[PDB]
Write a protein that binds this ligand. Structure first.
Ligand code: CL
Ligand code: CL
Ligand code: CL
Ligand code: CL
Ligand code: CL
Ligand code: ZN
Ligand code: ZN
Ligand code: ZN
Lengths: 110, 111
């Protein structure tokens, strides 16, 4: 989320390495849209049901299940993509990248 | 979340402090505040546990995925606890204010 963007900024790189990294982004960008989508949909499902009847209901129950699973999915996809970017780093840059990742996770960033 | 902070103000400002629906309102709030603090503590711990896994071994693993799932679950518990509370508070609000209350709620939900 902002986790994703934070880790991109911990990634030191010249003019060449950046253009290459951006080209490599598209695999994850799409995966992602696919997930920010289901989640944004599950939320609208939630809000729709509440504007209808602001009380718990089978629709609200189902929507919240959907919101949850989707947000987990999104963090998992983010992490997968973050470890792939880690693999493309020179060994000398790995410790700083790990530090940023661990500390962001620890304080609840995604 | 779910516009909670702002919904409570709508409460401070619809049922007067010379009303005593006030007392009941604040007791419900005390209970929710306590449940939230507990769930939040549990989310903080799931976050630490995910961070710990990654520090131990910075790569995707069943251990890291596991932690991820504990985090989603604590987070979902928090949203659910908050929503059911928000509904409870609405049911205790005089019909003359549900309109404005419902606005704030749906707004926030649609974000
Ligand atoms: Cl350069
Ligand atoms: Cl409230
Ligand atoms: Cl208060
Ligand atoms: Cl609290
Ligand atoms: Cl990996
Ligand atoms: Zn990326
Ligand atoms: Zn109050
Ligand atoms: Zn409240």
């Amino acid at each position: 989320g902002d986790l994703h963007e934070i880790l991109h900024e911990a990634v030191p790189l010249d003019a060449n390495e950046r253009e290459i990294l951006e080209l490599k982004e598209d695999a994850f960008a799409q995966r992602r849209r696919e997930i920010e989508t289901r989640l944004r949909a599950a939320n609208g499902k939630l809000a729709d049901a509440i504007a209808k009847n602001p009380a718990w209901s089978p629709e609200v129950e189902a929507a919240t299940q959907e919101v949850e699973r989707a947000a987990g999915d999104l963090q998992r996809a983010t992490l997968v993509h973050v470890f792939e970017m880690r693999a493309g780093l020179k060994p000398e840059h790995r410790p700083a990248y790990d530090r940023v990742l661990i500390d962001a996770l620890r304080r609840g960033s995604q």
